[PDB]
């Protein structure tokens, strides 16, 4: 069947005024189908790859087995025209190889293919056949294998995949080994997430696994009532590189898995549990405490992350009598009811980050928050975090923010998308000064490339542009948000 699709296709056949389908040590100078030379020349690229993969070409200093493979499968997403060549390729350099290693790697090629684009309606029965075919010659001899070519054949029958379902990316090293060792062993792939406190939870992963479900099973795990779910998201975080990307809930995990070996940022990212969203007023929190209060996990997991913000200088506009409170609280939340304690910097140092205490002599610090400590002996741990974040809340405009990296042609060049209840603003990342303010009522409408995010004003509209690759997480943001008012 294959051979009767490839007589009217491939240029071996046509050049007919059959052994085109056999393995070759060297790297083919023309491709099998007959094609535009412009196609041709991309289809020769590919090979010496799909070679580099089975290791039957050398990879370069810069690059490995599953860069090599990432490559082909996106070669194979964005040249449409080039599907048919590329599953050709890969099942020719199966066919009589002299190394069972390779064309292993071969048919492996054909399942990673498979789970990300279908070959041509024309091709799609005549190379399931084949495969089908060489199972069946083989399924006695090497069982393994035929394993192998058993699950191509499921991953090719799927077809066509939903949209919502269609993977973006190639597969990690990760994804590749997960795979390799579930076909030997048939154990479980997992992803570990990380919380605020460094607690992790394991997450049963798949293939199409998407950002949202796993968030949705490790936050049921650590015991966030089924409401709070939603208010809950997952960010990259690299700590030797100081980044905390916001990881989009509509994107699969293995997407973004191969995306992190593509990062030339240096130190380890790892997935960490945040509380994404705020819908309850701030300046209400002492009045409506329960909305905050009623999930005890959530609400330990929302004051020890906006803490951790308050700790690290991410609110740094706050002057120091509000600084001097906040310290006040914190001290008392360490030293319950340690009325007769003496202040000291190490106290200090333990609830003021470095970015405030520097305006002032940590002498005069203590000073200032000896004041504000004596009607807060009373009040109990719960409501002590209430007036923490009250204060946060009220004082900070960067609370409540989902924060993106974005470049301008407007000052700063370098600059931070916040999204949050009210609207889009766009902040100083040094002076975390607002430069804009947009609410969602004068944004008549968003539009995203990958590479930009651009919001229209009033009425026809301003168009504002930014520079940002994140437009993924931009949109799920974005429209949480803007879908309440």
């Known amino acids: 069947q294959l051979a009767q699709w490839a007589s009217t296709r491939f ?12 393995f070759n040590k060297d790297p083919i100078k023309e491709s099998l189908i007959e094609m535009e030379a412009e196609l041709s020349e991309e289809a020769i690229k590919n090979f010496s790859e799909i070679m580099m993969w089975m290791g039957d070409y050398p990879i370069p200093k810069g690059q490995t087995a599953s860069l090599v493979i990432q490559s082909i499968i996106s070669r194979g997403i964005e040249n449409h025209e080039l599907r048919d060549e590329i599953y050709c390729q890969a099942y020719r350099q199966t066919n009589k190889n002299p190394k069972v290693e390779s064309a292993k790697k071969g048919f492996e090629l054909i399942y990673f293919l498979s789970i990300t684009f279908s070959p041509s309606d024309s091709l799609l029965q005549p190379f399931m056949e084949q495969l089908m075919s060489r199972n069946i010659a ?9 394993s192998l070519i058993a699950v191509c054949i499921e991953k090719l029958e799927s077809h066509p995949i939903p949209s919502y379902q269609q993977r973006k990316m190639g597969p990690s090293a990760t994804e590749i080994q997960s795979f390799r060792s579930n076909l030997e062993n048939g154990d479980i792939s997992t992803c570990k997430i990380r919380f605020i406190d460094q607690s992790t939870k394991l997450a049963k992963i798949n293939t199409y696994t998407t950002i949202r479900e796993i968030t949705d099973t490790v936050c049921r795990q650590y015991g ?8 809950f998201g997952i960010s990259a975080v690299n700590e030797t590189a ?3 990307k916001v990881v989009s809930e509509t994107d699969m995990i293995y997407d973004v898995l191969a995306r992190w070996e593509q990062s030339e940022e240096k130190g380890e990212f790892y997935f960490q549990v945040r509380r994404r969203f705020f819908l309850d007023d701030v300046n209400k929190i002492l009045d409506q405490e329960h909305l905050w209060t009623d999930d005890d996990i959530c609400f330990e997991l929302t004051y020890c992350q906006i803490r951790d913000e308050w700790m690290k200088g991410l609110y740094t506009n706050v002057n120091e009598k509000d600084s001097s409170i906040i310290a006040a609280i914190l001290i008392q939340l360490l030293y319950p009811n340690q009325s007769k304690l003496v202040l000291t910097k190490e106290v200090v140092r333990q609830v003021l980050p470095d970015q405030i205490l520097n305006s002032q002599n940590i002498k005069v610090w203590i000073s200032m928050i000896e004041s504000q ?11 002590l975090k209430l007036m923490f974040i009250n204060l946060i809340g009220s004082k900070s405009p960067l609370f409540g923010c989902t924060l993106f990296n974005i470049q301008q042609k407007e000052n700063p060049p370098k600059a931070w998308l916040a999204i949050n209840k009210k609207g889009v603003s766009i902040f100083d990342p040094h002076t975390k000064e607002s430069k804009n303010f947009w609410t969602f009522q004068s944004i008549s409408n968003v539009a995203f490339t990958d590479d930009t995010f651009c919001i229209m004003t009033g009425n026809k509209p301003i168009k504002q542009t ?4 994140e437009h993924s997480s931009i949109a799920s943001v974005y429209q949480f948000y803007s879908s309440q008012l």
């Open 242 to 244: 100081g980044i905390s």
């Open 11 to 22: 240029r071996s056949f046509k050049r007919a005024s059959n052994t085109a389908f056999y």
């Open 466 to 469: 930014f520079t940002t690759d």
């Open 224 to 231: 966030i009532s089924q409401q709070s779910i939603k208010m």
């Open 373 to 383: 400590i004596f009607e807060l002996v009373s009040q109990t741990p719960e409501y």
């Open 138 to 146: 083989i399924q006695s001899s090497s069982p393994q294998l035929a």
